[PDB]
Amino acid sequence: SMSVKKPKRDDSKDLALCSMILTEMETHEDAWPFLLPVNLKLVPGYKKVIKKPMDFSTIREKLSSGQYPNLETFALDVRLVFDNCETFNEDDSDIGRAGHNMRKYFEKKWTDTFK
């Protein structure tokens, strides 16, 4: 509360460490469904159904331009990429399986880097 603060967790490396995680996601072999924005002209249904599209290139630009206020807002966009994927793709599809694999990969890196 006012003039009563928990001890200061060092956040000075968060930007660099989120960038490293994102590099690792970018270079995973199952990243290909997620590298670029879904083409809203060429994929029927996507625009109406997915209210907040997100992809790795869009996260990378937001990261690079100071549009994440803290590490939690970064994790929310990453998870949005996988939640979108599950909304639109059957579990038993190459893209559906890619999304589950990447989410697993991300969540382990996140825990090991920050928890």
Short mmCIF file of all heavy atoms in Angstrom, two decimals, residues 46-111:
data_model
loop_
_atom_site.label_atom_id
_atom_site.label_comp_id
_atom_site.label_asym_id
_atom_site.label_seq_id
_atom_site.Cartn_x
_atom_site.Cartn_y
_atom_site.Cartn_z
N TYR A 46 -11.30 -16.77 -40.67
CA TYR A 46 -10.30 -16.34 -39.62
C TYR A 46 -10.59 -15.01 -39.02
O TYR A 46 -10.60 -14.85 -37.76
CB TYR A 46 -8.85 -16.37 -40.15
CG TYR A 46 -7.88 -16.66 -38.97
CD1 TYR A 46 -7.63 -17.97 -38.53
CD2 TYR A 46 -7.23 -15.61 -38.31
CE1 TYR A 46 -6.73 -18.22 -37.47
CE2 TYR A 46 -6.30 -15.86 -37.26
CZ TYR A 46 -6.07 -17.15 -36.82
OH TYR A 46 -5.20 -17.40 -35.71
N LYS A 47 -10.88 -14.05 -39.92
CA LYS A 47 -11.13 -12.68 -39.48
C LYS A 47 -12.30 -12.59 -38.49
O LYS A 47 -12.22 -11.96 -37.43
CB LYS A 47 -11.33 -11.76 -40.72
CG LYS A 47 -11.32 -10.26 -40.39
CD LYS A 47 -11.27 -9.40 -41.66
CE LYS A 47 -10.78 -7.98 -41.41
NZ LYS A 47 -11.73 -7.22 -40.57
N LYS A 48 -13.41 -13.24 -38.82
CA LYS A 48 -14.60 -13.18 -37.92
C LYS A 48 -14.46 -13.95 -36.63
O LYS A 48 -15.00 -13.61 -35.56
CB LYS A 48 -15.85 -13.74 -38.74
CG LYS A 48 -17.19 -13.61 -38.04
CD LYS A 48 -17.56 -12.15 -37.81
CE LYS A 48 -18.90 -12.00 -37.07
NZ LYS A 48 -19.96 -12.02 -38.07
N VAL A 49 -13.82 -15.10 -36.73
CA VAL A 49 -13.76 -15.98 -35.59
C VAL A 49 -12.68 -15.56 -34.58
O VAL A 49 -12.93 -15.63 -33.37
CB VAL A 49 -13.48 -17.44 -36.09
CG1 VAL A 49 -13.18 -18.38 -34.93
CG2 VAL A 49 -14.72 -17.93 -36.90
N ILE A 50 -11.52 -15.15 -35.07
CA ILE A 50 -10.34 -14.90 -34.12
C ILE A 50 -10.25 -13.42 -33.85
O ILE A 50 -9.83 -12.66 -34.71
CB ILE A 50 -9.03 -15.45 -34.70
CG1 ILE A 50 -9.19 -16.97 -34.96
CG2 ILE A 50 -7.82 -15.07 -33.73
CD1 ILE A 50 -9.26 -17.82 -33.74
N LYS A 51 -10.69 -13.03 -32.68
CA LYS A 51 -10.94 -11.61 -32.43
C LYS A 51 -9.60 -10.86 -32.26
O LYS A 51 -9.49 -9.68 -32.61
CB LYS A 51 -11.79 -11.46 -31.15
CG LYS A 51 -13.18 -12.14 -31.22
CD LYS A 51 -13.97 -11.74 -32.47
CE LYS A 51 -15.31 -12.44 -32.55
NZ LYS A 51 -16.13 -11.85 -33.66
N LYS A 52 -8.59 -11.57 -31.76
CA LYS A 52 -7.27 -10.97 -31.58
C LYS A 52 -6.15 -11.83 -32.17
O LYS A 52 -5.57 -12.64 -31.44
CB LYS A 52 -7.06 -10.83 -30.10
CG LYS A 52 -8.00 -9.79 -29.47
CD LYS A 52 -7.90 -9.71 -27.94
CE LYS A 52 -6.52 -9.17 -27.51
NZ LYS A 52 -6.47 -8.96 -26.03
N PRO A 53 -5.87 -11.69 -33.45
CA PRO A 53 -4.78 -12.46 -34.14
C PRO A 53 -3.44 -12.09 -33.54
O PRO A 53 -3.25 -10.93 -33.09
CB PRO A 53 -4.86 -12.03 -35.60
CG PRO A 53 -6.31 -11.54 -35.75
CD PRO A 53 -6.73 -11.00 -34.42
N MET A 54 -2.58 -13.11 -33.39
CA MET A 54 -1.22 -12.84 -32.86
C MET A 54 -0.30 -13.86 -33.53
O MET A 54 -0.78 -14.99 -33.84
CB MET A 54 -1.21 -12.85 -31.35
CG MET A 54 0.11 -12.40 -30.72
SD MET A 54 0.76 -10.78 -31.34
CE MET A 54 -0.66 -9.79 -30.94
N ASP A 55 0.97 -13.49 -33.73
CA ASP A 55 1.95 -14.35 -34.36
C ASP A 55 3.33 -13.90 -33.84
O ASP A 55 3.49 -12.77 -33.33
CB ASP A 55 1.94 -14.29 -35.92
CG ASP A 55 2.37 -12.87 -36.44
OD1 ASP A 55 1.50 -11.95 -36.33
OD2 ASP A 55 3.51 -12.78 -36.86
N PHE A 56 4.36 -14.72 -34.08
CA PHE A 56 5.70 -14.42 -33.57
C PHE A 56 6.29 -13.14 -34.13
O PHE A 56 6.95 -12.43 -33.38
CB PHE A 56 6.67 -15.59 -33.82
CG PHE A 56 6.29 -16.91 -33.10
CD1 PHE A 56 6.94 -18.07 -33.43
CD2 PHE A 56 5.38 -16.96 -32.01
CE1 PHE A 56 6.63 -19.30 -32.82
CE2 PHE A 56 5.11 -18.20 -31.38
CZ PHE A 56 5.71 -19.33 -31.80
N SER A 57 6.08 -12.84 -35.43
CA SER A 57 6.66 -11.61 -36.03
C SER A 57 6.09 -10.33 -35.40
O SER A 57 6.84 -9.36 -35.19
CB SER A 57 6.54 -11.58 -37.60
OG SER A 57 5.20 -11.22 -37.93
N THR A 58 4.80 -10.34 -35.10
CA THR A 58 4.08 -9.29 -34.43
C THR A 58 4.55 -9.15 -32.97
O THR A 58 4.88 -8.02 -32.48
CB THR A 58 2.57 -9.50 -34.53
OG1 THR A 58 2.21 -9.55 -35.95
CG2 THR A 58 1.82 -8.36 -33.78
N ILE A 59 4.81 -10.26 -32.31
CA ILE A 59 5.38 -10.20 -30.92
C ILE A 59 6.78 -9.60 -31.01
O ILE A 59 7.19 -8.82 -30.12
CB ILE A 59 5.41 -11.59 -30.23
CG1 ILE A 59 3.99 -12.14 -30.05
CG2 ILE A 59 6.19 -11.57 -28.92
CD1 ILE A 59 3.89 -13.63 -29.63
N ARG A 60 7.56 -10.03 -32.01
CA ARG A 60 8.93 -9.56 -32.13
C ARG A 60 8.98 -8.01 -32.37
O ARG A 60 9.79 -7.29 -31.72
CB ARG A 60 9.67 -10.31 -33.19
CG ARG A 60 11.02 -9.79 -33.67
CD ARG A 60 12.08 -9.96 -32.63
NE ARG A 60 12.54 -11.32 -32.42
CZ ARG A 60 13.27 -11.72 -31.38
NH1 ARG A 60 13.63 -10.88 -30.42
NH2 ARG A 60 13.63 -12.96 -31.24
N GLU A 61 8.11 -7.49 -33.20
CA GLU A 61 8.03 -6.05 -33.44
C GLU A 61 7.56 -5.27 -32.16
O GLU A 61 8.05 -4.17 -31.85
CB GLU A 61 7.05 -5.82 -34.57
CG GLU A 61 6.90 -4.37 -35.01
CD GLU A 61 8.23 -3.75 -35.54
OE1 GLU A 61 9.01 -4.46 -36.19
OE2 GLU A 61 8.48 -2.53 -35.25
N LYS A 62 6.55 -5.79 -31.45
CA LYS A 62 6.08 -5.20 -30.21
C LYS A 62 7.25 -5.18 -29.15
O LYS A 62 7.46 -4.16 -28.40
CB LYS A 62 4.84 -5.92 -29.71
CG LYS A 62 3.57 -5.67 -30.50
CD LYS A 62 2.38 -6.38 -29.95
CE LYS A 62 1.99 -5.89 -28.58
NZ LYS A 62 0.71 -6.49 -28.37
N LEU A 63 7.98 -6.27 -29.07
CA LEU A 63 9.09 -6.40 -28.13
C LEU A 63 10.20 -5.36 -28.41
O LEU A 63 10.67 -4.68 -27.52
CB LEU A 63 9.67 -7.81 -28.11
CG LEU A 63 10.64 -8.22 -26.94
CD1 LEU A 63 10.00 -8.13 -25.56
CD2 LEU A 63 11.22 -9.61 -27.02
N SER A 64 10.59 -5.29 -29.67
CA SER A 64 11.61 -4.41 -30.15
C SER A 64 11.28 -2.91 -30.05
O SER A 64 12.21 -2.09 -30.21
CB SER A 64 11.98 -4.80 -31.62
OG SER A 64 12.58 -6.09 -31.62
N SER A 65 10.03 -2.53 -29.92
CA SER A 65 9.57 -1.16 -29.97
C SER A 65 8.97 -0.72 -28.62
O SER A 65 8.21 0.24 -28.56
CB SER A 65 8.58 -1.02 -31.09
OG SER A 65 7.46 -1.85 -30.91
N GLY A 66 9.27 -1.48 -27.54
CA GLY A 66 8.76 -1.10 -26.17
C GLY A 66 7.32 -1.07 -25.97
O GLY A 66 6.77 -0.34 -25.14
N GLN A 67 6.61 -1.95 -26.68
CA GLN A 67 5.17 -2.08 -26.48
C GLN A 67 4.70 -3.15 -25.43
O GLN A 67 3.50 -3.29 -25.15
CB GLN A 67 4.52 -2.40 -27.84
CG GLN A 67 4.67 -1.21 -28.82
CD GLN A 67 3.93 -1.48 -30.13
OE1 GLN A 67 2.73 -1.58 -30.14
NE2 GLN A 67 4.65 -1.62 -31.19
N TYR A 68 5.66 -3.88 -24.84
CA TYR A 68 5.34 -4.69 -23.64
C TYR A 68 5.75 -3.95 -22.34
O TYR A 68 6.99 -3.79 -22.08
CB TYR A 68 6.03 -6.09 -23.64
CG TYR A 68 5.42 -6.98 -24.79
CD1 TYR A 68 6.19 -7.35 -25.89
CD2 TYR A 68 4.06 -7.29 -24.82
CE1 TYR A 68 5.65 -8.12 -26.95
CE2 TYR A 68 3.51 -8.05 -25.88
CZ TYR A 68 4.31 -8.45 -26.94
OH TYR A 68 3.81 -9.14 -28.00
N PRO A 69 4.76 -3.58 -21.54
CA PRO A 69 5.12 -2.94 -20.26
C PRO A 69 5.81 -3.86 -19.28
O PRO A 69 6.59 -3.37 -18.49
CB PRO A 69 3.77 -2.48 -19.69
CG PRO A 69 2.75 -3.03 -20.54
CD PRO A 69 3.32 -3.53 -21.81
N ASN A 70 5.57 -5.18 -19.33
CA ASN A 70 6.24 -6.06 -18.38
C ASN A 70 6.26 -7.51 -18.94
O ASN A 70 5.68 -7.80 -20.04
CB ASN A 70 5.50 -6.00 -17.03
CG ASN A 70 4.03 -6.34 -17.17
OD1 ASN A 70 3.66 -7.40 -17.71
ND2 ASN A 70 3.19 -5.45 -16.74
N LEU A 71 6.98 -8.40 -18.26
CA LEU A 71 7.12 -9.77 -18.82
C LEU A 71 5.75 -10.52 -18.90
O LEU A 71 5.60 -11.42 -19.75
CB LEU A 71 8.24 -10.59 -18.08
CG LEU A 71 7.82 -11.31 -16.80
CD1 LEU A 71 8.93 -12.26 -16.38
CD2 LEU A 71 7.52 -10.29 -15.70
N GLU A 72 4.76 -10.18 -18.08
CA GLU A 72 3.47 -10.86 -18.14
C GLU A 72 2.65 -10.52 -19.40
O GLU A 72 1.93 -11.38 -19.94
CB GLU A 72 2.64 -10.56 -16.87
CG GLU A 72 3.34 -11.01 -15.56
CD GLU A 72 3.80 -12.50 -15.51
OE1 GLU A 72 3.22 -13.42 -16.21
OE2 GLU A 72 4.76 -12.78 -14.73
N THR A 73 2.77 -9.28 -19.88
CA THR A 73 2.04 -8.90 -21.06
C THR A 73 2.69 -9.65 -22.23
O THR A 73 2.00 -9.93 -23.17
CB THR A 73 2.05 -7.33 -21.27
OG1 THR A 73 3.40 -6.87 -21.36
CG2 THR A 73 1.34 -6.64 -20.07
N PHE A 74 4.01 -9.90 -22.20
CA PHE A 74 4.70 -10.67 -23.27
C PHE A 74 4.14 -12.12 -23.28
O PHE A 74 3.73 -12.61 -24.34
CB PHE A 74 6.20 -10.65 -23.06
CG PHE A 74 6.99 -11.60 -23.88
CD1 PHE A 74 7.32 -11.33 -25.19
CD2 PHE A 74 7.35 -12.84 -23.34
CE1 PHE A 74 8.00 -12.23 -25.94
CE2 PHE A 74 8.06 -13.72 -24.05
CZ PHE A 74 8.39 -13.45 -25.41
N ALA A 75 4.09 -12.75 -22.10
CA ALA A 75 3.56 -14.18 -21.98
C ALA A 75 2.10 -14.29 -22.45
O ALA A 75 1.70 -15.28 -23.05
CB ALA A 75 3.74 -14.67 -20.54
N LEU A 76 1.31 -13.24 -22.21
CA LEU A 76 -0.09 -13.24 -22.63
C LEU A 76 -0.20 -13.30 -24.19
O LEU A 76 -1.05 -14.00 -24.70
CB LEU A 76 -0.86 -12.04 -22.09
CG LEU A 76 -1.26 -12.06 -20.58
CD1 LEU A 76 -1.81 -10.69 -20.19
CD2 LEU A 76 -2.28 -13.19 -20.27
N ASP A 77 0.61 -12.52 -24.91
CA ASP A 77 0.61 -12.57 -26.41
C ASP A 77 1.13 -13.92 -26.90
O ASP A 77 0.62 -14.41 -27.88
CB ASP A 77 1.47 -11.44 -27.02
CG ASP A 77 0.65 -10.16 -27.36
OD1 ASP A 77 -0.60 -10.23 -27.23
OD2 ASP A 77 1.24 -9.14 -27.81
N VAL A 78 2.19 -14.49 -26.27
CA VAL A 78 2.66 -15.80 -26.71
C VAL A 78 1.49 -16.82 -26.56
O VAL A 78 1.23 -17.59 -27.44
CB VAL A 78 3.91 -16.26 -25.95
CG1 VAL A 78 4.37 -17.63 -26.35
CG2 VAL A 78 5.04 -15.32 -26.24
N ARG A 79 0.85 -16.84 -25.38
CA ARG A 79 -0.22 -17.81 -25.10
C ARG A 79 -1.39 -17.58 -26.06
O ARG A 79 -2.03 -18.55 -26.48
CB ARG A 79 -0.70 -17.76 -23.62
CG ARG A 79 0.42 -18.26 -22.70
CD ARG A 79 0.16 -17.93 -21.24
NE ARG A 79 1.28 -18.47 -20.44
CZ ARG A 79 1.77 -17.92 -19.33
NH1 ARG A 79 1.22 -16.83 -18.79
NH2 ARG A 79 2.82 -18.49 -18.76
N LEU A 80 -1.69 -16.31 -26.40
CA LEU A 80 -2.71 -15.97 -27.38
C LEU A 80 -2.49 -16.65 -28.72
O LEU A 80 -3.45 -17.11 -29.34
CB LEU A 80 -2.84 -14.42 -27.56
CG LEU A 80 -3.78 -13.88 -28.61
CD1 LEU A 80 -5.26 -14.29 -28.25
CD2 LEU A 80 -3.62 -12.35 -28.63
N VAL A 81 -1.23 -16.76 -29.16
CA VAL A 81 -0.89 -17.43 -30.39
C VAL A 81 -1.39 -18.93 -30.32
O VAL A 81 -2.03 -19.42 -31.26
CB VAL A 81 0.62 -17.44 -30.66
CG1 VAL A 81 0.98 -18.35 -31.86
CG2 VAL A 81 1.17 -16.04 -30.91
N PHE A 82 -1.20 -19.58 -29.16
CA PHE A 82 -1.59 -20.98 -29.04
C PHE A 82 -3.04 -21.22 -28.80
O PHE A 82 -3.61 -22.21 -29.37
CB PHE A 82 -0.68 -21.70 -28.06
CG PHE A 82 0.78 -21.52 -28.37
CD1 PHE A 82 1.62 -21.06 -27.42
CD2 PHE A 82 1.27 -21.66 -29.69
CE1 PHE A 82 2.97 -20.83 -27.73
CE2 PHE A 82 2.58 -21.41 -30.01
CZ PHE A 82 3.46 -20.98 -29.03
N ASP A 83 -3.67 -20.31 -28.08
CA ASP A 83 -5.11 -20.30 -27.86
C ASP A 83 -5.85 -20.04 -29.13
O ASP A 83 -6.81 -20.79 -29.43
CB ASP A 83 -5.53 -19.27 -26.78
CG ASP A 83 -5.01 -19.62 -25.40
OD1 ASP A 83 -4.55 -20.77 -25.13
OD2 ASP A 83 -5.07 -18.70 -24.52
N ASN A 84 -5.41 -19.08 -29.92
CA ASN A 84 -5.95 -18.92 -31.31
C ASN A 84 -5.84 -20.19 -32.14
O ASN A 84 -6.79 -20.56 -32.88
CB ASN A 84 -5.28 -17.77 -32.06
CG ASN A 84 -5.67 -16.40 -31.50
OD1 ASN A 84 -6.61 -16.27 -30.73
ND2 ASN A 84 -4.94 -15.36 -31.92
N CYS A 85 -4.67 -20.81 -32.10
CA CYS A 85 -4.43 -22.00 -32.90
C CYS A 85 -5.44 -23.13 -32.48
O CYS A 85 -5.99 -23.82 -33.35
CB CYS A 85 -3.01 -22.54 -32.68
SG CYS A 85 -2.53 -24.03 -33.60
N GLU A 86 -5.64 -23.30 -31.19
CA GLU A 86 -6.59 -24.36 -30.71
C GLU A 86 -8.03 -24.03 -31.08
O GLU A 86 -8.86 -24.93 -31.32
CB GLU A 86 -6.54 -24.50 -29.19
CG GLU A 86 -5.44 -25.34 -28.70
CD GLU A 86 -5.63 -25.76 -27.26
OE1 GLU A 86 -6.72 -26.32 -26.95
OE2 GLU A 86 -4.68 -25.56 -26.48
N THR A 87 -8.35 -22.74 -31.12
CA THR A 87 -9.69 -22.29 -31.54
C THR A 87 -10.02 -22.66 -33.00
O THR A 87 -11.16 -23.02 -33.34
CB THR A 87 -9.93 -20.76 -31.30
OG1 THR A 87 -9.95 -20.52 -29.91
CG2 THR A 87 -11.29 -20.27 -31.85
N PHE A 88 -9.05 -22.58 -33.87
CA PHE A 88 -9.25 -22.74 -35.29
C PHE A 88 -8.84 -24.08 -35.91
O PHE A 88 -9.22 -24.32 -37.08
CB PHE A 88 -8.56 -21.57 -36.04
CG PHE A 88 -9.22 -21.19 -37.34
CD1 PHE A 88 -10.35 -20.37 -37.35
CD2 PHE A 88 -8.65 -21.56 -38.57
CE1 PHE A 88 -10.95 -19.98 -38.56
CE2 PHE A 88 -9.22 -21.15 -39.78
CZ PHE A 88 -10.37 -20.38 -39.78
N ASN A 89 -8.07 -24.91 -35.20
CA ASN A 89 -7.45 -26.08 -35.81
C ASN A 89 -7.81 -27.31 -34.94
O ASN A 89 -7.84 -27.25 -33.69
CB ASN A 89 -5.95 -25.98 -35.92
CG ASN A 89 -5.52 -24.88 -36.83
OD1 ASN A 89 -5.26 -25.11 -38.01
ND2 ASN A 89 -5.34 -23.68 -36.27
N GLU A 90 -8.16 -28.38 -35.64
CA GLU A 90 -8.34 -29.65 -34.96
C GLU A 90 -7.01 -30.08 -34.27
O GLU A 90 -5.90 -29.97 -34.87
CB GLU A 90 -8.89 -30.74 -35.90
CG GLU A 90 -10.42 -30.66 -36.15
CD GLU A 90 -11.31 -30.98 -34.94
OE1 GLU A 90 -10.87 -31.59 -33.95
OE2 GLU A 90 -12.48 -30.63 -34.99
N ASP A 91 -7.14 -30.62 -33.04
CA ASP A 91 -5.98 -31.31 -32.36
C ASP A 91 -5.23 -32.33 -33.27
O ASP A 91 -4.00 -32.39 -33.32
CB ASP A 91 -6.42 -31.98 -31.04
CG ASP A 91 -6.88 -30.99 -30.00
OD1 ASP A 91 -6.60 -29.77 -30.11
OD2 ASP A 91 -7.58 -31.42 -29.07
N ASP A 92 -5.98 -33.11 -34.03
CA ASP A 92 -5.41 -34.10 -34.93
C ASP A 92 -5.20 -33.50 -36.35
O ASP A 92 -5.90 -33.88 -37.34
CB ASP A 92 -6.36 -35.33 -34.96
CG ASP A 92 -5.77 -36.54 -35.73
OD1 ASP A 92 -4.54 -36.60 -36.02
OD2 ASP A 92 -6.56 -37.46 -36.06
N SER A 93 -4.30 -32.53 -36.44
CA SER A 93 -3.90 -31.86 -37.71
C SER A 93 -2.45 -31.51 -37.51
O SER A 93 -1.98 -31.47 -36.37
CB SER A 93 -4.76 -30.61 -38.01
OG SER A 93 -4.60 -29.53 -37.06
N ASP A 94 -1.70 -31.28 -38.57
CA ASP A 94 -0.31 -30.88 -38.40
C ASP A 94 -0.23 -29.55 -37.59
O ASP A 94 0.60 -29.45 -36.69
CB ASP A 94 0.43 -30.78 -39.69
CG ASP A 94 0.52 -32.16 -40.41
OD1 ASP A 94 1.44 -32.92 -40.11
OD2 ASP A 94 -0.28 -32.34 -41.35
N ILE A 95 -1.09 -28.59 -37.91
CA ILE A 95 -1.02 -27.28 -37.27
C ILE A 95 -1.47 -27.39 -35.81
O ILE A 95 -0.82 -26.79 -34.93
CB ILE A 95 -1.83 -26.20 -38.03
CG1 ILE A 95 -1.14 -25.93 -39.39
CG2 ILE A 95 -2.05 -24.93 -37.20
CD1 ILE A 95 -1.96 -25.06 -40.31
N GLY A 96 -2.49 -28.24 -35.55
CA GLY A 96 -3.06 -28.42 -34.20
C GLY A 96 -1.95 -29.04 -33.29
O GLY A 96 -1.75 -28.61 -32.14
N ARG A 97 -1.22 -30.02 -33.81
CA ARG A 97 -0.13 -30.68 -33.10
C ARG A 97 1.05 -29.72 -32.87
O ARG A 97 1.62 -29.69 -31.77
CB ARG A 97 0.37 -31.92 -33.84
CG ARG A 97 -0.45 -33.17 -33.58
CD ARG A 97 0.20 -34.44 -34.18
NE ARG A 97 0.11 -34.51 -35.64
CZ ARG A 97 -0.97 -34.87 -36.33
NH1 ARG A 97 -2.07 -35.20 -35.70
NH2 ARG A 97 -0.94 -34.85 -37.66
N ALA A 98 1.35 -28.91 -33.90
CA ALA A 98 2.38 -27.86 -33.81
C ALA A 98 2.08 -26.96 -32.65
O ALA A 98 3.03 -26.61 -31.88
CB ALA A 98 2.53 -27.06 -35.07
N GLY A 99 0.84 -26.51 -32.54
CA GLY A 99 0.47 -25.60 -31.44
C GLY A 99 0.62 -26.14 -30.06
O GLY A 99 1.16 -25.51 -29.14
N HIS A 100 0.20 -27.39 -29.89
CA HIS A 100 0.45 -28.06 -28.60
C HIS A 100 1.88 -28.20 -28.29
O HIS A 100 2.24 -27.94 -27.17
CB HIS A 100 -0.25 -29.42 -28.56
CG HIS A 100 -1.72 -29.30 -28.49
ND1 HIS A 100 -2.37 -28.80 -27.39
CD2 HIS A 100 -2.69 -29.65 -29.35
CE1 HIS A 100 -3.67 -28.78 -27.60
NE2 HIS A 100 -3.89 -29.29 -28.79
N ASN A 101 2.71 -28.63 -29.26
CA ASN A 101 4.15 -28.77 -29.05
C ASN A 101 4.85 -27.44 -28.64
O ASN A 101 5.68 -27.33 -27.68
CB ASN A 101 4.83 -29.31 -30.30
CG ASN A 101 4.54 -30.83 -30.56
OD1 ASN A 101 3.96 -31.50 -29.79
ND2 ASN A 101 4.96 -31.28 -31.70
N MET A 102 4.50 -26.38 -29.37
CA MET A 102 5.11 -25.05 -29.11
C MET A 102 4.70 -24.50 -27.75
O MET A 102 5.52 -23.81 -27.12
CB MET A 102 4.75 -24.08 -30.25
CG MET A 102 5.34 -24.41 -31.63
SD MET A 102 7.14 -24.54 -31.72
CE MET A 102 7.81 -23.00 -31.08
N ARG A 103 3.47 -24.69 -27.37
CA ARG A 103 3.00 -24.21 -26.07
C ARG A 103 3.79 -24.90 -24.94
O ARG A 103 4.29 -24.24 -24.01
CB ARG A 103 1.53 -24.43 -25.88
CG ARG A 103 0.97 -24.00 -24.53
CD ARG A 103 -0.41 -24.54 -24.15
NE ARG A 103 -1.47 -24.21 -25.08
CZ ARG A 103 -2.19 -23.07 -25.07
NH1 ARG A 103 -2.00 -22.08 -24.18
NH2 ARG A 103 -3.19 -22.96 -25.93
N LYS A 104 3.85 -26.24 -25.02
CA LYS A 104 4.76 -27.00 -24.13
C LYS A 104 6.17 -26.48 -24.05
O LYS A 104 6.70 -26.24 -22.95
CB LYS A 104 4.68 -28.47 -24.48
CG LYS A 104 5.47 -29.33 -23.45
CD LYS A 104 4.53 -29.66 -22.29
CE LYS A 104 5.11 -30.65 -21.30
NZ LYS A 104 4.24 -30.76 -20.08
N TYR A 105 6.84 -26.31 -25.20
CA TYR A 105 8.14 -25.78 -25.29
C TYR A 105 8.28 -24.40 -24.61
O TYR A 105 9.29 -24.13 -23.90
CB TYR A 105 8.55 -25.73 -26.80
CG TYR A 105 9.92 -25.41 -27.15
CD1 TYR A 105 10.98 -26.36 -26.96
CD2 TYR A 105 10.27 -24.18 -27.68
CE1 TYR A 105 12.28 -26.06 -27.33
CE2 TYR A 105 11.57 -23.88 -28.01
CZ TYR A 105 12.60 -24.84 -27.81
OH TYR A 105 13.91 -24.53 -28.18
N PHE A 106 7.30 -23.52 -24.88
CA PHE A 106 7.33 -22.16 -24.33
C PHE A 106 7.20 -22.19 -22.77
O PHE A 106 8.04 -21.54 -22.09
CB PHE A 106 6.14 -21.31 -24.81
CG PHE A 106 6.00 -20.00 -24.01
CD1 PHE A 106 7.02 -19.00 -24.08
CD2 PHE A 106 4.90 -19.73 -23.23
CE1 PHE A 106 6.90 -17.80 -23.37
CE2 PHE A 106 4.80 -18.55 -22.50
CZ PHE A 106 5.80 -17.59 -22.55
N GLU A 107 6.29 -23.00 -22.27
CA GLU A 107 5.94 -22.98 -20.87
C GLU A 107 7.11 -23.50 -20.02
O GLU A 107 7.39 -22.95 -18.90
CB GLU A 107 4.65 -23.71 -20.60
CG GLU A 107 3.36 -23.07 -21.04
CD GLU A 107 3.08 -21.60 -20.61
OE1 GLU A 107 3.72 -21.05 -19.69
OE2 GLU A 107 2.19 -21.00 -21.20
N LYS A 108 7.84 -24.48 -20.55
CA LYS A 108 9.05 -24.93 -19.89
C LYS A 108 10.15 -23.86 -19.85
O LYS A 108 10.77 -23.64 -18.79
CB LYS A 108 9.58 -26.22 -20.54
CG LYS A 108 11.01 -26.63 -20.13
CD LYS A 108 10.98 -27.90 -19.34
CE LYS A 108 12.34 -28.60 -19.42
NZ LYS A 108 13.39 -27.96 -18.60
N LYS A 109 10.43 -23.23 -20.99
CA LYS A 109 11.40 -22.13 -21.02
C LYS A 109 11.02 -21.00 -20.08
O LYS A 109 11.93 -20.34 -19.51
CB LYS A 109 11.58 -21.48 -22.38
CG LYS A 109 11.91 -22.35 -23.55
CD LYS A 109 13.39 -22.62 -23.57
CE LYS A 109 13.73 -23.39 -24.81
NZ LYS A 109 15.14 -23.72 -24.67
N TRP A 110 9.72 -20.74 -19.96
CA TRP A 110 9.23 -19.64 -19.14
C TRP A 110 9.50 -19.93 -17.61
O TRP A 110 10.07 -19.12 -16.94
CB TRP A 110 7.75 -19.43 -19.35
CG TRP A 110 7.19 -18.18 -18.73
CD1 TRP A 110 6.39 -18.11 -17.67
CD2 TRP A 110 7.41 -16.81 -19.17
NE1 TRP A 110 6.06 -16.79 -17.41
CE2 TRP A 110 6.70 -15.98 -18.31
CE3 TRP A 110 8.14 -16.23 -20.20
CZ2 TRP A 110 6.68 -14.55 -18.45
CZ3 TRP A 110 8.13 -14.84 -20.35
CH2 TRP A 110 7.40 -14.02 -19.49
N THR A 111 9.10 -21.12 -17.17
CA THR A 111 9.32 -21.64 -15.83
C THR A 111 10.80 -21.69 -15.50
O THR A 111 11.19 -21.18 -14.44
CB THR A 111 8.72 -23.05 -15.70
OG1 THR A 111 7.31 -22.88 -15.82
CG2 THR A 111 9.02 -23.67 -14.28
#
